[PDB]
Design a protein around this ligand. Structure first.
Ligand SMILES: CC(=O)N[C@@H]1[C@@H](O)[C@H](O[C@@H]2O[C@H](CO[C@]3(C(=O)O)C[C@H](O)[C@@H](NC(C)=O)[C@H]([C@H](O)[C@H](O)CO)O3)[C@H](O)[C@H](O)[C@H]2O)[C@@H](CO)O[C@H]1O
Ligand SMILES: CC(=O)N[C@@H]1[C@@H](O)[C@H](O[C@@H]2O[C@H](CO[C@]3(C(=O)O)C[C@H](O)[C@@H](NC(C)=O)[C@H]([C@H](O)[C@H](O)CO)O3)[C@H](O)[C@H](O)[C@H]2O)[C@@H](CO)O[C@H]1O
Ligand SMILES: *[C@@H]1O[C@H](CO)[C@@H](O[C@@H]2O[C@H](CO)[C@@H](O)[C@H](O)[C@H]2NC(C)=O)[C@H](O)[C@H]1NC(C)=O
Ligand code: SIA
Ligand code: NAG
Ligand code: NAG
Ligand code: CA
Ligand code: CA
Lengths: 320, 172, 172, 172, 320, 320
C-alpha cells in the first residue's frame, strides 16, 4: 500500500582483506599496498653527474693505479664502487683503509696538486715493477715515485722533502713504505745502512722502519708496499725525513664537496631517475615502506619486516 | 560498526549500484528506480584521497652507507650498527602496522558515518509524512511519484504540502 | 562519551546483570524481568579480543649483547651506546603510552556505540507503539506480556499487531 | 563530520555567542533570547585540557653530548652517529606529524559529538510536544514563555504538562 | 499505566583506573597490564643445548686455562659467562680482548686443530709455572707451549715456525708474548740480545717488541703474558719469526656456527623455557613491554620507563 | 505560528588552519604550537653551581696549563667548554683525547693528590720551556715535571717511580712522552742510549719509545709532548720504568660525582633556569618538540624537521 524510499551503499563481488585495530580478517571494497617488494636491477642515473669506477677501487684513484687512470680527477655527485675492484697492483695494505674509502665515497670530486718534490743525482725516482703494467711495459702508481739508489748496493742519501698547503682547504697526502723480500734485495736498493722514515706535520708525527723478511708471493711479488695517509691543514707543511724505503708522493689529493657513494653490482641506466639505491639496484616507489634490504642509501622508504600491509581505500564490503 | 548503518541496520550492499558509493532505491505505483548520492559519495572519496596524500610519502632525509658491502667492518662497531639497525627496523615495522590498522578502522567507520548522516538528513526532510522501516527504508504515507522521489534525493521535498494526507493515512 | 549512551542518557550500569555486557529490564502487569543481549555483548568482546591479539606480542628479532656486564667498554663507544639505548627507550615509552591511551579511548567509545546501536534497533522495532523515556527506557502503549517482551529481545516483534491499540493509548 | 552536527545539519556557528561553546536561541510571543550551555561547553574544554596535559611534555631523560662542537670526531663513529641521529629524527618527525593529525581529527569529532548529544538530550525532553526543524531547531507546538524556555535549558521541562495542547496543535 | 522496557549495560563494584587521550583517571570494568615488572632469577634453558662456563672465561677456552679444561671443545646454541671468571692463570692481557670475547660468545661451538710444531733436542718444551696448577703440580696453558734452552741466560736462536690451514673454513690462531719484570729475568729466558717477534700471513702482518719494566704483582707474578690473535684463511700459512719471548700454540681454534651469549649470575633451571635473558635472569612474559633492564639479549619485550600501563578490556564502569 | 528553540555552537571571524588525518587545510576556532622555533642566546644557570672554563680546555685542568691555573680543582654540577680553549701550551696530542674530555665533562668536580715522586742528583726535574709562560718567566705544566739529565749529553739514569692509590675511589693518572726534533737534541737531554718508558699497573701495561724526527714548528717548538692516561683502582699501584723521555706526574687527578657538560659560545645569565642547552644557548619551552638543533644536552624537547605543527584546541570554525 505505502510507497518506499530505501537507502543503501555499493558492494563488489571480489572484496579485499585488510587488518584493523579489532579484526585481522576485514573485507573492504578496495585496498592499496604500502610495502614495496619489487626491485629494479639497474642504477637509475638520469639527472646525475655520476662516475662508474668499474674495475677501479676508490683508494686507487688517490695513488693512481693503472686501473684508475681515467678516474685520477674530475667532479661527480654520485660515485659507484664495484665488487673485487683493484686498489693495489703491487701487493700491500693501507692503514685505516676503511676510514679512507668512506671519505672518498662521501666526496663529490678529486683535484690533484703537484708536491714539487725533487731528488739528488744519487737517487733514481723512476723505479717501476712488473705488478703495475701500463702501455704494455713495467710502471708504477701515477701519483707516487719509487726512490732507489742509482748505483746498486750504494747507501741511499739522507734526503728531506717538505710539502706546504698553499690552498684554503685541507689536502689529503698519501705515501708508501716498501718492505723488501730479502736482506740482499734491501742492500741493492737502499744500501747496508739501517733504514728510518720519519714523517712530521703540525697535526701528525710517525716513524716507519721497513720490515725485511721472506713471505708468500702475491701477483708474483714477495715484497709489500704498505700505504699511509693524513690530512694537511691549510698553511701547514708535512716533512719526510728518509734514508731509503719511502714511496714519496708526486701529487696530493683534494676531495671537493659532497656526493652519494653506491656499492652495487647492477648495470647503469641513464633513462630512469631514482633517489634510493642498494646492492641489488634502485627503488623508485612512491610507497612509504619497503622489504628489499635494510642496507640502502639516499632518500629511501623505511625498511619493515612485512611481506604486505594493505591500506583500505573503501567501506566494508557486505555482499548479497 | 561504530555508527550502525553499514554491516548494521542496512542488511547488505548493492552490487547493482556502480555510479556511486551511497544512494537510493524507491518503489511507487509508477514502478522501481535507483540513483546514487553525489555529495555523500564525494565526501567519503575526498577523505580517503586525503589519507593517501599523507601516507604515500617518504622522508627527504639523505642517508649514507655505514656498513661496507665488499669488506669486513670492525667486529665491535659492526655489532653496535647491527643492534641499532635492528632496533630502528622493529620501530618502523611497529609504526607501519599501527598506522595502517588505525587508518583502516577510521576509513571503515568514516564510510559508515556518511551513510548514517544521509539517512538522518532524509528522516528529518520527510518529518511526519513517513516512518522508519528498520532496514534503512522509509514507508511514505502518500502518493510519491518520480518527481516527488527526485525532490527527496535533491533535498527540496516540502513536508507541509503532503502533511494532511500523510497524517490521515498514518492514524488510519 | 562520544555516542552519549554510557555515562550519558543511561544514568548508570547494572551490577545485577552478570550474564552479559548489554541487556534489558522490563516491567508489565505480570511483573519484572532481566535478560542479557548476546549478539551485542559478543560484538564488544570480539573487538577487545582482536586488540589483545595485536598488542600482547613481542618482535621475533634476535638481539645480541653490545655492552659487557663484567668489563669496561671504550668510554667513547660506551657513551654512543648509552645515547642510542636512551633514545630508543624514549621512543618505545612514548609509543607504549600513546598505544594504550588511544586503544583505551577507542575501547570505551566502541562499547558506548554498541549500547546506542542496540537502543536504536529496539526504537525502530517498536515504531509508533512506544515513546522514548529519555533514560534509555521505552514506555510501551499496550499490554506487553513476557512473550511480547521476549519478541522485542529476539527482534521478532511485529508493530502492526499492536499499532491500533497503541496509537489510541498515545493520543488518549 | 562523523556525527553530522557541526559543518552538518547545523548550517553555521554563532559569532554572537561569546559566553560558551554550545547553546540555545529561542523565539516566542515574548520575543527572542540567547543562552550558552555550561555542562556541554565544560565537557568539551575538559577533554581538550586533558590532551594538552598529555602532549605538552618532554621526557625527564638526561642526555650527554656524543658529538664535539669544537673538534673533529673519528670519521667512522661520526658517520654512525650521523646515521643514528637522522634515523631517530625521521621517527620523531613522523610520530609528531601523526600525533597532532590524529588528535586534531579527534578534537573536531569530539566537539561535533558534544553538539549532537545536547540536541538528543533536548529532543527526548520535548518528547511529542515538538518536531525537528532539520537545521538543529525544534518547532514547539504550544505557548512556551521565557520561564518554559528556561525549563528546557535547565533540563526541568515536564512534557506531560503541555502534552494534550501540543498533540492537538500537531494533528490539527 | 504503560508497560516499560529499559536498556542497560553491566557494571562492577571494584572498577580499574586507566589513562585515555583525554582523561588520566578513567574507571573501566576490567583492564590488563602491558608492562612486565616480575623477573625470574633463573636461566630457563629447556630445549637449549647450553654450556655454563662457570669459573672459566671464554678467552680461557682458546688458550686452555686449568679452569677451562672441561670447556676446551664442544657445540652449543647458548653460552653462559659468569662474574670474575678466570681468563688467564698467569697475569696478562689480550690485545683486542673485548673483540675476541664477543666473537666467542656469538659462536655455537669450538673445534681444536694441532699445529704439529716440533722442537730440537737443545730446547726443553715442558717449561711450566706455579701460576697454572693442574693435577696438584706446576703446569701451563693446554693449547700453548713455553720452551727454553738447557743453558739459562743463553741467547735464544732466531727460529721460524709456519702453520698452514688445511681446512675449508677460517681458523683462529692465538699466541702469547712474555713481558719480563726486570733485565735479570729478560736475560735468563731469551738471552742478552734484543728480542723481536714478527708474524706474517697473506692478510695479516705485525712486529712485537717484548717490553721489560717493573710493575705490581698479580697472582704473585710481576711478569705479564699478553695474548695476540688473528684469523688464518683456508689454504693460507702464518709464519712466526722470533728470537725469544714468543709463546707458541700447540693447537689453533675453529669457531662453529651461531649461538646466544648470556652474561648472568643467576642459577640454571632446565624445566622452564625462555627466549629473553638479562644479568638478573629470564623474562617469560607474553606482554609487549618490560621495565626490568635495558640490557637484554634474545627475542625480548621492549624496555620502557613505566611502572605500569593498564589496557582497558571493558566499557566505562558507572556504578549505582 | 509556533515558538521554536534552536541549538548551535560558537564561531570566530579569524579562524586557524590545522592538519588532520584526512584534510591539510582544516579551519578551527583556536590552536596552539607544538614545535619550538625561538632560542635564548644565553646559558640559563640559575640554581646551578656552574664553572665557566673560558680560555681553559678541560684536559688542561688535569695537566695544569697556565690558562687553567684557576681551574686546577673545585666542585660543580655544570661545566662549560668554549671554542679555541687551550689544552697544550707546548705542542702535542693526548691518546684517546675525546674519551678523556667526555669523562671530565661528565664529572662534577676535580681533586688533586701528590704522587710524591723523587729523583736522583743526576736528574733535573725543573725543566721548563718558553711555550708555557707563567709569572713572566719560562715554566711547565703545573701537575707534571720535565725530567732531563743534569750534565748535558750524559745518559739519563734508569729510575723507577711507583704511585699507590691510598683512597677508596679510582684516581686518573696522566703522564707525557717527549718526542725530540733531532738526534742532537735527544742526546743532549737523555744521552746516547736507546730510550724505553715502561708503565705498569694491575689493569694497565704499555711501552713508549720516544720518536725522534724533523717536523714543523708549532708555538715555536719542533719538539712534541704526547700525553697518555689511565685509571688507577683503589689500593693498586702504577710503576714508571724510564731511562729518559718521560714527563712524570707531580699530582694525579680524582673526578668527583656527576655533572652536565655544555659546549657553547653563548654568555651566562644567572637569572633564568633551563634543563636543555645547545651550541647557540638554552631552550626553556614546555612544548614537546623543537627545530633549533639535533645536537642538544640535558632534558630536551625532541628534534623534528618541521617549521610548525598546530594542535587544534577548539571545534571546526563555520562562520556566518
Ligand atoms: C726465589 C728464587 O730465586 N727462585 C724460586 C722462585 O721462582 C719462587 O719464587 C717465585 O718465583 C716466581 C717466578 O718463578 C717461575 C714460576 O712462575 O714458577 C719459575 C719458572 O721456571 C718460570 N717458567 C717459565 C716457563 O718461564 C716462570 C716464568 O719465567 C715467570 O712466571 C715469568 O714472569 O717463573 C715469581 O716471580 C714469584 O713472585 C716468586 O715469589 C720460590 C717460591 O716458589 O722458589 C724459589 O726457589
Ligand atoms: C739562540 C740561542 O743560542 N739560545 C736560546 C734558544 O734556545 C732559543 O731558540 C729556540 O730554542 C728552542 C729550544 O728552547 C727550549 C724551549 O722550549 O724553550 C729551552 C728550554 O729551556 C729547553 N728545556 C728543556 C727542559 O730541555 C727546551 C727543550 O730542550 C726543547 O723544547 C725540546 O724540544 O728548549 C728551539 O731549539 C728552537 O728551535 C729555537 O728557536 C731562543 C728563543 O728565545 O732563546 C735563546 O736564548
Ligand atoms: C651483522 O648482521 C649481518 C646479518 O645479520 C651479518 O652478516 C652475515 O654473516 C653470515 C656469516 O658470516 C653470512 O652467512 C650472511 O650472509 C651475512 N648476512 C648479511 C646480510 O650480511 C654480520 O656478520 C653481522 N655483523 C656482526 C659483526 O655480527
Ligand atoms: C725500482 C726497482 O728496483 N724495481 C724492481 C723491483 C725491486 O727491485 C724489488 O724487487 C722490490 O720489490 O723488483 C722487481 O722484480 C719487481 O718487483 O717487479 C723488478 C723491478 O724492476
Ligand atoms: C655529520 O653531519 C654534519 C652535519 O650534516 C657534518 O658537518 C659532518 O661533516 C658529518 N660528519 C661526518 C664525519 O660525516
Ligand atoms: C532550573 O530551572 C528551573 C526552571 O525555572 C528553576 O526553577 C530551577 O531552580 C532550576 N533547577 C535547579 C536544580 O537549579
Ligand atoms: Ca656517561
Ligand atoms: Ca657523512
Amino acid at each position: 500500500d505505502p510507497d518506499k524510499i530505501c537507502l543503501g551503499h555499493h558492494a563488489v563481488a571480489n572484496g579485499t582483506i585488510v587488518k584493523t585495530l579489532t579484526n585481522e580478517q576485514e573485507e573492504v571494497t578496495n585496498a592499496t599496498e604500502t610495502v614495496e617488494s619489487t626491485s629494479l636491477n639497474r642504477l637509475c642515473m638520469k639527472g646525475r653527474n655520476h662516475k662508474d669506477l668499474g674495475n677501479c677501487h676508490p683508494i686507487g684513484m688517490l695513488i693512481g693505479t693503472p686501473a684508475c687512470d681515467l678516474h685520477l680527477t674530475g667532479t661527480w655527485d654520485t660515485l659507484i664502487e664495484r665488487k673485487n675492484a683493484i686498489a693495489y697492483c703491487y701487493p700491500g695494505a693501507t692503514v685505516n683503509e676503511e676510514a679512507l674509502r668512506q671519505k672518498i665515497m662521501e666526496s663529490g670530486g678529486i683535484s690533484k696538486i703537484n708536491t714539487g718534490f725533487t731528488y739528488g743525482s744519487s737517487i733514481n725516482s723512476a723505479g717501476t715493477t712488473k705488478a703495475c703494467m701500463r702501455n704494455g711495459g713495467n710502471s708504477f702508481y701515477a701519483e707516487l715515485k719509487w726512490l732507489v739508489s742509482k748505483n746498486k748496493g750504494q747507501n741511499f742519501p739522507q734526503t728531506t722533502n717538505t710539502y706546504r698547503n698553499a690552498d684554503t682547504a685541507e689536502h689529503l697526502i698519501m705515501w708508501g713504505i716498501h718492505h723488501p723480500s730479502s736482506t740482499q734485495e734491501k742492500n741493492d736498493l737502499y744500501g747496508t745502512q739501517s733504514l728510518s722514515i720519519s714523517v712530521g706535520s703540525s697535526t701528525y708525527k710517525n716513524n716507519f722502519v721497513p720490515v725485511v723478511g721472506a713471505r708468500p708471493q702475491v701477483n708474483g711479488q714477495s715484497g709489500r708496499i704498505d700505504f699511509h695517509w693524513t690530512l694537511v691543514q691549510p698553511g701547514d707543511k708535512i716533512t719526510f725525513s728518509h734514508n731509503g724505503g719511502l714511496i714519496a708522493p708526486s701529487r696530493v689529493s683534494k676531495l671537493i664537496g659532497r656526493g652519494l657513494g653506491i656499492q652495487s653490482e647492477a648495470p647503469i641506466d641513464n633513462s630512469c631517475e631514482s633517489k634510493c639505491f642498494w646492492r641489488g639496484g634502485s627503488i623508485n616507489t612512491r610507497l612509504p615502506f619497503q622489504n628489499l634490504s635494510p642496507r640502502t642509501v639516499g632518500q629511501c622508504p623505511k625498511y619493515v619486516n612485512k611481506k604486505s600491509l594493505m591500506l583500505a581505500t573503501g567501506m566494508r564490503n557486505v555482499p548479497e | 560498526g561504530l555508527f550502525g548503518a553499514i554491516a548494521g541496520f542496512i542488511e547488505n550492499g548493492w552490487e547493482g549500484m556502480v555510479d556511486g558509493w551511497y544512494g537510493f532505491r524507491h518503489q511507487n505505483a509508477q514502478g522501481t528506480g535507483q540513483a546514487a548520492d553525489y555529495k555523500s559519495t564525494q565526501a567519503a572519496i575526498d577523505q580517503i584521497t586525503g589519507k593517501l596524500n599523507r601516507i604515500i610519502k617518504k622522508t627527504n632525509t639523505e642517508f649514507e652507507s655505514i656498513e661496507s658491502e665488499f669488506s669486513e667492518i670492525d667486529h665491535q662497531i659492526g655489532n653496535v650498527i647491527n643492534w641499532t639497525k635492528d632496533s630502528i627496523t622493529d620501530i618502523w615495522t611497529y609504526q607501519a602496522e599501527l598506522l595502517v590498522a588505525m587508518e583502516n578502522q577510521h576509513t571503515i567507520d568514516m564510510a559508515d558515518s556518511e551513510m548514517l548522516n544521509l539517512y538522518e538528513r532524509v528522516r528529518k526532510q520527510l518529518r511526519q509524512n513517513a516512518e522508519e522501516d528498520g532496514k534503512g527504508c522509509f514507508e511514505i504515507y502518500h502518493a510519491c511519484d518520480d518527481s516527488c522521489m527526485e525532490s527527496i534525493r535533491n533535498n527540496t521535498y516540502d513536508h507541509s504540502q503532503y502533511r494532511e494526507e500523510a497524517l490521515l493515512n498514518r492514524l488510519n
